[model samples]
Target: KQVDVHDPVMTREGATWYLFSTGPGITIYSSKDRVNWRYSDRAFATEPTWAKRVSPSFDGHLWAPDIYQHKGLFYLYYSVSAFGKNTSAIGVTVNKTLNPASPDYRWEDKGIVIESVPQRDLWNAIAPAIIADDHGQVWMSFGSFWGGLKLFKLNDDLTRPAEPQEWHSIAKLERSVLMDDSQAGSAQIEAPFILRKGDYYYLFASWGLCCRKGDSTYHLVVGRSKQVTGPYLDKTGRDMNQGGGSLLIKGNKRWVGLGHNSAYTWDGKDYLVLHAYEAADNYLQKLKILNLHWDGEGWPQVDEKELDSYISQRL
Candidate 1:
């Protein structure tokens, strides 16, 4: 399957698997065996009414959509960013069913879940990843360069933050003094995805730049904590908040940048999903799904060879 996607999130309903990705109006794709894909539908026929209001430069090109299924409803959370600046908002729309052919299929737009302003807010609100903890409480982990990754509890409705506002800075790297306070600066890190495995919650984020040809330096770095609201520590026992993480996978010569990953488990097996810049294809972004493995040491691993072996065909 010749499927072109970015920030792809997958979920299953019966036999067919649904994928939501960063595209104009959030492009939706469907696959039967996870190898062959076909075009499906767009979440929005028109741009979000509140999009331009939040950022004047907002076009229909939405970025980094995270799809979650909660209480039998499908929740699609997407990021609305203003080109390069720190102006962004994470908004969600709930659907009765992902299958458009279903009798109850409808996408209802909810309001913004989180918003970011340049200087007022140090963090960029681009990538939104949602995870439900073991205790049944919902939490949203999101951020970009400036202030790194952050987590906060969400309300019962899952549209907004919970009351009392419990929040945590899950991970980050220090920004340079030479850079302006308002700028995202040289501390290039973002796209936080937390995966719950057995006894620990693994916090993964991309380190370095993404979306460049010559210097496309995206790589995956990770840490883990027993608790969801974590002081996530890397291999050396250094806290992720103190700029500590263990390198999981980085781009090789074929793939220049590997970033923005989501992990899932099915039938007792695990997989990691992300998009990589394929240098051989003029740096065109390609979808990559690799078997996620855990070592005897309790660290996550991805075989570097699978980057080339696992290919999604476009039908």
Candidate 2:
């Protein structure tokens, strides 16, 4: 079956699992066993009017959605942009529940959270990931293609930036031939997902070109820090801002171009969720999930053997 997906985000409500991804209108899928998935609905049935205000050339599609539940509501953050350009905006929507049969299952658009103007901001604002610290303070990590990955504090309600509107640089890479340096050095790092395990906060991101099928070089890398607002370091104790990261996973013979991940835990076991291109199927992008393990030194790693076993059982 064709799973056609990209830049996936994973979440769970009770025993059911939900996967949201970048698509024509922010596509969503649901599963009971986490192995077999079925399409649900798009967050927006029609193009939102406000999305065009920031990127006038937006094609009614959104990219890189991050979904999480806070208090009693579900908040979804997504990006709008003209392809290959920096004019972009991140928007948020709220829903009491994702269950279609529930009376409170309507998604209410909350409007733009932040935007990037070509010459005004050095970084393109997209790929929004939200995480709450131990102190219960919420922060958003986002950016791509221009400048690098950035972090900003979000208001308690998650509607907008907290007071002062300050931002910080978290992860980036040195300039390379694979980068686009139109306005600035293409740092190549994007899709920042933060996972808190033990006493360390792990920052996972993709570092290479994506969406290019067999030509794509996407792969997953990670760094960690004790503080949510990080000076995150890789396994070698190199700073993430200095282009330091430890490899998590990459393409195999069956799949290529894997990256843009979301981390989740269920029944006390950790999992990494993302998308990869099917190598045998013209590099068709599809959703993928793999078990995540913590090493003795507290660093996270992926076991490809276990992933193959799980896939074999499912097949």
Candidate 3:
């Protein structure tokens, strides 16, 4: 009824549902009914050759990755860097198909899409999410606590930045300029996942401590903007760039922490997917996918009952 997962994201390719998550080589699982899942293939056979170049001791664990399907290729954007530091970069790889069983299954590690140096850049380039605007222009939204979430226009290839280098910071938190540039400080926010529903682009982010054992305060908050590039504002009409975000989900008694979600519309229902840490089981993280509902005001919400009702079996 539960499965070990971290910062997981799901997408349907053909008739099968494949999940990609943060791990060595980006651990993958396949589901036929979106419930019972079995082990699938890892996107990378070995550590990315470019990781160490970004950080001399970059641990092989690849953080949040976004899987985007464009044309016939799947652009899988993954992050590599030292945890909690701005010394990070988001790299993307393209595969003809996510199904490793297919003859065309091969991930081509294209290289870095966005990079953040410790002193030079205020933002950490992790947690990448790709969204194409109504005008067909592709943009990648990404960041972690140094300067909050940012958006960059991606070229048609979707692997690199587009010409003219358009950029915008959709969300940010205040940090002391006197603090060391390498330190993420106590500004506990990260993992930006943007979802478009109706007329607005909803910017979702984790707004507290994660992976902090029993003391973890990980929760989800969101803001929305009509354009892909913000000025995303909360229900109070305060800009997310100034730290205004409406609450989405948080930890419960059994689950100690929750955040970093991916959303999609499947068959007629909208679903929000993320991992929740279970203190009942020693604070280990497990996958949780809830039915996303919208009220008359058009804000996204998830029924709390599903926290205990929905179950995923690992076959």
Candidate 4:
């Protein structure tokens, strides 16, 4: 029952669902019945030497990877950065055979998807979320702690970036104590995920402090827009930065500090997958899943008990 997962991706490969997260590197858990989980022995541990060549300082640090299966291949995208700056980069690793358990489960490294430097006009890019539009084009929304959320177009193979990449300023918070400007005013907007419901697209993120020792106020916030990369406004028709985000999950509840989530649908039910601090004593977070429902006006809400019984009933 002890699982360390971050930015979980719930994907079904035939009858099994694999949950991928970040740590020393990408760690994976697979379940046949959803309640019980078994860890995969190895992950995509191989990387190009060019990675070290690019930045000798950034020897070995990895965070927030999103994995998906497309066209009979499994693709893992990850973030490599230092403390809390844009001196970061994103990379892709692919397994052509689709089976991660095989002895020949080789992950080919496609170097440097996006890179960020300080005061370069563009914020540092991290937290890559890949979603394919109706036109079959793949768009990656990535950025955090700097300017805001950004979107880029990826090649059909999903390994490399396409010709032109468009950067849209989606959700960025005002500099404040929550943003911790006393040190430096870096806007805190992370875990960019997109949920397509009806005719609208809902974008979810967390804006506040995370891992604050004993006291923390991290929670999930959301906004929706007619366009994928533009002014995603909340219910009040105000920009997500101005109107800010309406609460999807709160901290006062038992499930405190729920942020940096990935949104997915299984068996026609929408779910929000994220990590949260269940007990004050437990500094390490646990994977929590919540049932996402729509209100009369079509906004996502998380009000259900995050237990396996509820998830079983849902299945």
| For every candidate, C-alpha RMSD to the true structure in Å | 1.3, 2.7, 1.1, 3.8
Q: What TM-score fits each model?
A: 0.97, 0.94, 0.97, 0.87
Q: Candidate 4 regions off by >4 Å?
A: 46-48, 53-61, 175-186, 241-243, 307-315
Write one digit per residue (lDDT tens) for candidate 1, span 64-162.
Answer: 999998999999999888766888999999998988888898889997999998768878888989988889899999988887899999999999999
Candidate 3's residue-wise lDDT over 1-315, tens digit each? Answer: 487789889988889999998998788899998788898978788888888888777767899989998897888999998866777889999988878888998999999998999888888889999888899899998988877778999987887899989999888889988888888876678888888898999988889888987888998998899988988999899998988999888887888888888999788899999988888888888888899999899899987667667678877
Q: lDDT for model 3, on a 0 to 1 scale?
A: 0.87
1 or 4: which has the higher lDDT?
Answer: 1
**Which of the two candidates, 1 or 3, achieves a greater lDDT against the reference?**
1
Each model's lDDT:
0.89, 0.84, 0.87, 0.70
Tell me the number of clashing residue pairs for each predicted model: 4, 0, 0, 0
lDDT of 4 by residue, 15-77 (tens): 887777776556767778655667763344544455555445664546678877787887888
Off by over 4 Å in 1: 176-179
Task: Record all residue pairs in model 1 with backbone atoms less than 3 Å apart, i.e. clashing.
Answer: 1-313, 1-314, 2-313, 2-314
| Candidate with the greatest lDDT versus the true structure | 1
Ranking by TM-score: 3, 1, 2, 4
For residues 198-229, write the lDDT of model 2, one tens digit per residue. Answer: 89899999998888877788899999999988
> Which segments of model 3 are wrong by more than 4 Å?
none
lDDT of 3 at 161: 92
